[PDB]
Each structure stands twice: as structure tokens, then as C-alpha cells.
């Protein structure tokens, strides 16, 4: 079974215009969290182990040659694109969970927004691996042999962003279904 | 295999504004019909038995503190939220099928819109169980050993609604793929 | 495992108005590619054989009685509806792959847009079978026992279109996830 995703804050997304000042067809956006998540029939949620790597793959289909972001101020020229990901707390959606990336020496760095090049008329595959939640979910412990009625969850947010004129604008974002993160 | 859902009448949905008169980021909305449905490879559709309970779970992520619905008349204050569900006939989409909920004494009541409290910055899980279709689908009977070419279907509609100034406004709705409902 | 679909160019779609000049609720649209596709764990993509038939089913739920398309010029009367499908190249999204339909004598015709009748208040099921890609994907060959790092892919585009006043307008479209097409 596979982690499901849904559009996150679609009414907040900026759009893209090309060099002819024509709006681009909406870009195709697909998020796939391949390794790292297992569905627990008894918990009715995806589970992972904080110790294990998980990986996220994003396919971004750029349908034309973008040059501007349309903003409140209007059309501003594109500086670059960023992929951003973070957890949020299902019972406190305004609270983020850092994601971390373990390096080849098993150190960990907090995962910062990464620059992506999105050539026109192409789908670009972006794979981010060796990821970890910086946190476990609260109340994982079973109570009365049944799931803790105060079981807490995270959700994953994967967003594509455009930097233009010293602000950021979301182009596309998806949020996952709830996840339990357990210790060992 | 799992029942798939899609946005239902997205161009008819009202939006929510907070106390600062700012529009809320679109709320996250996920519908899961857990128990009650089985996929029939030969019928190429989900099947259930009218006798069996089915259950629906809705996760509603409220991203901010809602206070107003934006309406044709403009911003009106929120009275409450309702979850509404009903079947429709795939060959007559303007025709509803009542859903019923069997009580703890095996009586059945028609399932009325239920009040839901949606605290801000939280995902609220709403589970509606012990549900039944008030009807079977027509033409379930096999003809020539093949599926009845007049096989009929229902689809499930699960909608989140806001009551404000003595009218109702849809905030989010999803409709399922087709379902066959059989007798025993 | 099942081919996943996503809305394609949603900001380019026209809407429908009825005889009372009221906009129709957005039509329900679901695309299912049943036979013809198999998921390859090692390639992390759906695969098919160019020799094999694949089939596509579309469920179109018409919610009211459409009479006009809303266009740049404004409301124009509906002539008919067309289903259109084609591949595109994932590394060149502006490049189509013809789909072909093999006839009952194993000839093949290029698959042209097909007229569909969409009666009001009904879901219409449209099944298009005996389909083939006119092409294989480039670089299918394994390199160093690992997938070719230049592996190419198609995506399927299935679109519902309205003909009005000698132009076409897209009402709904979905695009699949990437596909490898192999020879025998």
C-alpha cells in the first residue's frame, strides 16, 4: 500500500508566465514517497521508524519556458526554483517538524530547501533520499491493548517554490496522509 | 483495493475567511471508506451487501481560525459545520439514495447531516459507522453469464458544509467511484 | 498496482453553461487504464509491450444539461463532444506519440478523436480498447545491469473536448504517470 497525497493550499499558489507574457499551463506535479513507510492495519495509518531512511521523489513537468512569477505586485522575473519539505503536526498544523538528511558519514543535517533546475518541456525527477524525521510522534504507546486514543501524527509537506524579488511563492504543494513515527 | 474519490463540484464551493477578513488557505479534506466495500474483478466495480455495515472516515484539516463564509451576499458569520452524505444514481445524478445508520438495537434511522466541531490548526477525524444504503442497485442479475448490460450503480457523496444566515454552503465535497449494492 | 492520473492543464479548461445561462457544476471525470500496464519494481515505472493491446475507460458525469461552452469570445453553442488521447514524451512534453487502434483484422489505424454523446444527469462510460503506442521508448536497454540512466518515458493524455464555432475547447483532461514501452 502507498502513501496518498493531496493538493495543499491550492488557493495560495502563484502562477508562471513566459517571455511572451502568456500564462503557462499549470505544471504537472507528482509526489512519491517510495521507501520508508509501512501501513499498519491495526493503527489505520502509515508507520515509520525514526531510525530508518525514507525517500521522496518529485516529478515536475514544466510545460513551456517560465520567466516570471505572477505576484500581488504583478509579474516579477524568476530567480530560481526550490524544493522544500517538512512535517507538520496533525493536531497543530501551524507547527513544523524538521526533516533531516543523514550524510555519507551518518552525521545528520537539517534538510534545507534545495535548488532545482527545471528545463522547459521536460519532466524533471527530483529524488531526495536518506531523510529522517527530527521527532517521534507523541503517544505511540498502546493503552488497554488498543491504540492510544491520544495517538499523534505527522503529515509530510512537499512544495515547489519560486524565488523572485526577495520573496518566495509556492507553485505547487502536496500534503500526505497521517504518519506515526516510532522509536526502536 | 481501495475506493477512489474525486473532487465533487469544486466550482460551487464557498470559501472561509478569518476574523482579520483574510481568506483561509483551502482546508485539507480526505475521505476514506474503510470497511464495507469489495472490488469485483468480473464486475469491474466495487460491491457491497445492503445487509452489511459500511463506514466512512473524513479527515478535515482546518488551517486557521474560520469565522466567515464568503457568499454571493458576501461575508456572513459561521453558525456551524455539517457533514452530509448520500448516494446518487449513476444513471440519474439528480436522484439521491438515502443512507441509513443502524442503531445499537438494529433499528435504522435515516442518516441526517451531523454537526462537527472543527478546532483551528487541527485535523479533525470524523468517523461515521454502521451505515447502509436504503436501496439496492437495479439489474444486478447476470444475463447470459455476463454482467447485465443494464447494471446500475451508486456513487457516494461526502460533503462538508457551513451553515450561515439560514442557508448552506459547501466547503468541500468528494464523490466515490461506482458501487454495486446487492441483496442476500 | 494501478496507473495513477492527475489533472492536466486545469487552468486552460473551458466551462459549460446550460440553457438558462447558468454555469454547470464541474463534470465528474475519471480515467482508468485497465489492461495493458504492469508495474516494474526494478524500473520504478509502469511497463507495457508495444505488441499488446491496452485499454482505457473514461467515466464522464454530466451534471445538468449543457448547451454552451464559455469561451474567450463568450458563450458559444455546443456542436459535440470529443474524446482525445495521445502520448507525450516525458523529456519533450511538446512532442506527441500517436496512439493506434488495431482493427478486427489486425490492421492498425491511428486513433482519431471520437465523438461521444453525454446525456444529462448521467455518467457515461467510454471504453476505448485495442490500443497501441506507435512508438517504443528510447534507451530501454539496461546498462551495467542497472536501468539505463537515459531511460525515456511516455505519459498518456486523455482529454474531453467540446467543439463549438469551429474551434476546440478542453473541458477536462488527465495525464498518467510515466510509462516504459518495450519491444519483444
Author numbering:
A (entry chain A), B (entry chain A), C (entry chain A): 349 to 532
Give the exact sentences the study uses for this entry.
Myelin-gene Regulatory Factor (MyRF, also known as MRF, Gm98 or C11Orf9 in human) is considered one of the master transcription factors for myelin production by oligodendrocytes in the central nervous system, which permits action potentials to propagate by saltatory conduction along axons and is very important for powerful brain functions. MyRF was revealed as a transmembrane (TM) protein located at the endoplasmic reticulum (ER) membrane. Its cytoplasmic portion contains an N-terminal proline-rich region and a following DNA binding domain (DBD) which can be auto-cleaved from the ER membrane by a region between the DNA-binding and TM domains. After cleavage, the N-terminal part of MyRF releases from the ER membrane and enters the cell nucleus guided by the NLS signal within its sequence to activate myelin gene expression.
Using limited proteolysis, we generated a proteolytically resistant DBD core that is about 24kD. The structural model has been completed and refined to 2.46 Å resolution (Rwork = 18% and Rfree = 23%). The space group is P321 (104.0, 104.0, 46.7, 90, 90, 120), with one molecule per asymmetric unit. Of the 210 amino acids corresponding to the DBD, only residues 351–532 were clearly visible in the electron density map. The main part of MyRF DBD consists of two antiparallel β-sheets that have three strands (a, b and e) and five strands (c’, c, f, g and β1) respectively, labeled according to the standard nomenclature of Ig-fold. The sheets pack against each other, forming a β-sandwich with a “Greek key” topology. MyRF DBD forms a trimer with a crystallographic three-fold symmetry axis in the crystal. Residues 438–442 of the loop between strand c and β7 from one protomer form 3 hydrogen bond interactions with residues 469–471 of strand e from the neighboring protomer. Residues 354–360 of the loop between strand β1 and β2 from one protomer form 4 hydrogen bond interactions with residues 371–377 of the loop before strand a from the other protomer. The electrostatic surface potential measurement of MyRF DBD structure reveals a highly electropositive surface owing to the presence of lysine and arginine residues at the bottom of the β-barrel core. In particular, 3 conserved alkaline residues in MyRF (K399, R454 and R478) are superimposable with the residues of Ndt80 (R111, R177 and R254) interacting at the major groove of DNA, implying that they may be involved in interaction with DNA too.
